[PDB]
Amino acid sequence: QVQLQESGGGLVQPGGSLKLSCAASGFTFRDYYMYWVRQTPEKRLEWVAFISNGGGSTYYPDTVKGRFTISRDNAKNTLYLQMSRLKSEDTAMYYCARGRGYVWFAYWGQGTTVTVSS
């Protein structure tokens, strides 16, 4: 069974930084593209980052491009999201996800909450 477990969230301040982790299991991690998706307090979903299977390519939406960095350590079966220069708007539940076939988000983790407050 596919399992994704995020961690690293907590209370932070605007301008601060933190790094989230996602431990993967139940599948061959190095064979799949991985993603980060977040859900704001108003329940809106927003795709945050993409990283190819070997870490060769990454993509981000304009809202977080020069601030967030997605990376992975295939030997550790772990996905990461470095979040720097935090904005209040980054407050959300962060989920790691894996796709299936042509679907980006087929499997989702339980999520970790990042709370940004002044």
Partner 1 sequence: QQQQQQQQQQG
Partner 2 sequence: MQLVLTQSSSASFSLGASAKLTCTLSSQHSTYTIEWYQQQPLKPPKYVMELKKDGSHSTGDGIPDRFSGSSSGADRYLSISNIQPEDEAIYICGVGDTIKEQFVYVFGGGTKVTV
Positions in the binding site for partner 2 (CB under 8 A): 37, 39, 43-47, 50, 59, 61, 95, 100-111
Residue type for 118, please? S
Interface residue list for partner 1 (CB under 8 A): 31-33, 53, 98-104, 106
Could you tell which of partner 1, partner 2, none binds residue 32, using a CB distance below 5 to 8 A set by kind? partner 1
59 binds, among partner 2, partner 1, none (CB under 5 to 8 A by kind): partner 2
Angle 69-71-76 from CA coordinates, rounded to 5°: 150
Q: How many Å apart are CA 48 and CA 59, to the nearest integer?
A: 9
Structure tokens at 110: 């339980």
From the CB of 104, what's the least distance to partner 1, in Å? Answer: 7
CB atoms within 10 A of CB 68: 22
